[PDB]
Design an enzyme around this catalytic site. Structure first.
Site, PDB file in Angstrom:
ATOM      1  N   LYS A   8       0.812  -1.189   0.000  1.00  0.00           N
ATOM      2  CA  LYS A   8       0.000   0.000   0.000  1.00  0.00           C
ATOM      3  C   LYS A   8       0.840   1.230   0.000  1.00  0.00           C
ATOM      4  O   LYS A   8       0.496   2.240  -0.609  1.00  0.00           O
ATOM      5  CB  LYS A   8      -0.893  -0.047   1.197  1.00  0.00           C
ATOM      6  CG  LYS A   8      -2.211   0.594   0.939  1.00  0.00           C
ATOM      7  CD  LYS A   8      -3.044   0.481   2.195  1.00  0.00           C
ATOM      8  CE  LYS A   8      -4.220   1.436   2.165  1.00  0.00           C
ATOM      9  NZ  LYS A   8      -3.918   2.723   1.498  1.00  0.00           N
TER      10      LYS A   8
ATOM     11  N   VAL B 108      -9.947 -15.334 -32.245  1.00  0.00           N
ATOM     12  CA  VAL B 108     -10.087 -15.198 -33.681  1.00  0.00           C
ATOM     13  C   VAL B 108      -9.619 -13.869 -34.175  1.00  0.00           C
ATOM     14  O   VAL B 108      -9.971 -12.828 -33.633  1.00  0.00           O
ATOM     15  CB  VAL B 108     -11.465 -15.394 -34.204  1.00  0.00           C
ATOM     16  CG1 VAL B 108     -11.302 -15.670 -35.698  1.00  0.00           C
ATOM     17  CG2 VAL B 108     -12.097 -16.548 -33.451  1.00  0.00           C
TER      18      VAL B 108
ATOM     19  N   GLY C  99       5.979 -15.839 -35.300  1.00  0.00           N
ATOM     20  CA  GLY C  99       4.526 -15.729 -35.359  1.00  0.00           C
ATOM     21  C   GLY C  99       3.907 -15.394 -36.709  1.00  0.00           C
ATOM     22  O   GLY C  99       2.957 -16.066 -37.085  1.00  0.00           O
TER      23      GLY C  99
ATOM     24  N   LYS D 143      -6.579  -7.475  -1.665  1.00  0.00           N
ATOM     25  CA  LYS D 143      -6.343  -8.550  -2.586  1.00  0.00           C
ATOM     26  C   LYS D 143      -4.998  -9.191  -2.346  1.00  0.00           C
ATOM     27  O   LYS D 143      -4.894 -10.379  -2.216  1.00  0.00           O
ATOM     28  CB  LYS D 143      -6.596  -8.037  -3.995  1.00  0.00           C
ATOM     29  CG  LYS D 143      -7.996  -8.379  -4.421  1.00  0.00           C
ATOM     30  CD  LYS D 143      -8.694  -7.361  -5.268  1.00  0.00           C
ATOM     31  CE  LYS D 143      -9.539  -6.380  -4.450  1.00  0.00           C
ATOM     32  NZ  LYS D 143     -10.212  -5.374  -5.299  1.00  0.00           N
TER      33      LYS D 143
ATOM     34  N   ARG E  66       3.070 -21.513 -34.797  1.00  0.00           N
ATOM     35  CA  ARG E  66       4.249 -20.727 -34.964  1.00  0.00           C
ATOM     36  C   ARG E  66       4.831 -20.970 -36.352  1.00  0.00           C
ATOM     37  O   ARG E  66       4.436 -21.897 -37.062  1.00  0.00           O
ATOM     38  CB  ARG E  66       5.250 -21.033 -33.891  1.00  0.00           C
ATOM     39  CG  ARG E  66       4.792 -20.514 -32.529  1.00  0.00           C
ATOM     40  CD  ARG E  66       4.944 -18.991 -32.335  1.00  0.00           C
ATOM     41  NE  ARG E  66       6.339 -18.522 -32.443  1.00  0.00           N
ATOM     42  CZ  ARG E  66       6.800 -17.302 -32.101  1.00  0.00           C
ATOM     43  NH1 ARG E  66       6.012 -16.345 -31.590  1.00  0.00           N
ATOM     44  NH2 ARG E  66       8.103 -17.037 -32.265  1.00  0.00           N
TER      45      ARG E  66
HETATM   46 NA    NA Z   1      -9.026 -11.343 -31.825  1.00  0.00          NA
END
Ligand code: NA
Ligand code: NA
Ligand SMILES: [Zn+2]
Length: 327
Positions: A52, A95, A181, A64, A141
């Site tokens: 904190k 997607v 990628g 938390k 990949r």
């Molecule tokens: Na997307």
DNA sequence: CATCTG
DNA sequence: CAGATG
């Protein structure tokens, strides 16, 4: 870097969720800095109160952190990980063409899965449609061994169309990576620059060639300088066809290639460091250029580059083979 | 940031 | 045109 890993990770889950599922961009930003600050913090957060103390860190997150520190988990994190609505969105989002926004609409409509989508192809647009159609290929990949074949084709066709073309495949493919990628091509031509008023044919011509030979399979988005698409290495002697790969091509005025080529080649860290050193060396560097720094605070004026070489020199640094452009 | 959609 | 997505 590990002394506060959980803390940071939990925070990141939390943030993400605010943003994707809820609309909570503030909250969402909230999780973000907190992680960032805790991320730097040099000690072992033994309690919420202790955190904190930090900035970004307020009351709720302390709470938390406590519960997490106290018991190997978080209720809220628990409740979120279950919930199908939340997971739907994290899923649809895979997607290519669905962002959270769309993910939410779809779910409310009841589409929550791959088939759902297929059944509802009407409700999807062109990018989305392509994304769906190649969901799988898209997650795969790209092995460099394929990348080399790729680059081999692209470069040969660009040449045939106009000797004066200058193509570069940026990305990690460039920094040496074994796999990647997608394929990022940086493109330029002499007759195109900073002032030179446009030349759309400049980009449209190559894209066209590529399709001609069938390297490019579909178009995601086609502007005058940036082309988003799909390509695929011709399947040899039928038995093994390749996956469909994501590919980007972008036109750059010759007068700011190497800054681009520099930049896009990364890594983020190498950039930053190079960025910070240039600032020392009395300069400024960005995606498109490098300028001398005036003392008045700041100051403009594009230095002139002919290679990634001109850039280093400027900031007076060791040329960096791309392989070692890591950090 | 550039492109698309609607 | 605002707003989405990469
Ligand atoms: Na997307
Ligand atoms: Na608004
Ligand atoms: Zn300590």
């Amino acid at each position: 870097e590990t002394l506060n890993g959980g803390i940071t990770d939990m925070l990141t889950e939390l943030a993400n969720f605010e943003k994707n599922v809820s609309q909570a961009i503030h909250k969402y930003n909230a999780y973000r800095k907190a992680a960032s600050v805790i991320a730097k913090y040099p000690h072992k957060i033994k309690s919420g109160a202790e955190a904190k103390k930090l900035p970004g860190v307020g009351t709720k997150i302390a709470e938390k952190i406590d519960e997490f520190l106290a018991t190997g988990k978080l209720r809220k994190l628990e409740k979120i990980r279950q919930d199908d609505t939340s997971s739907s969105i994290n899923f649809l989002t895979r997607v290519s063409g669905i962002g959270p926004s769309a993910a939410r609409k779809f779910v409310d409509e009841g589409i929550k899965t791959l088939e759902d989508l297929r059944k509802n192809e009407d409700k999807l647009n062109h990018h989305q449609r392509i994304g769906l159609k190649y969901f799988g290929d898209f997650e795969k990949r790209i092995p460099r061994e394929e990348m080399l074949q790729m680059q081999d084709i692209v470069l040969n066709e660009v040449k045939k169309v106009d000797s004066e073309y200058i193509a570069t495949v940026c990305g990690s493919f460039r920094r040496g990576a074994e796999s990647s990628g997608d394929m990022d091509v940086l493109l330029t031509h002499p007759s195109f620059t900073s002032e030179s008023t446009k030349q759309p044919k400049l980009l449209h011509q190559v894209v066209e060639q590529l399709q001609k030979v069938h390297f490019i399979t579909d178009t995601l988005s086609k502007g005058e300088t940036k082309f988003m698409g799909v390509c695929q290495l011709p399947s040899k002697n039928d038995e093994k066809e390749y996956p469909h790969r994501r590919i980007d091509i972008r036109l750059i005025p010759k007068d700011q290639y190497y800054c681009g080529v520099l930049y896009f080649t990364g890594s983020d860290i190498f950039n930053k460091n190079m960025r910070a050193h240039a600032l020392e060396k009395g300069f400024t560097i960005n995606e498109y250029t490098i300028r001398p720094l005036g003392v008045t605070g700041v100051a403009g004026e594009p230095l002139p580059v002919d290679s990634e070489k001109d850039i280093f020199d400027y900031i007076q640094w060791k040329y960096r083979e791309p392989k070692d452009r890591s950090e």
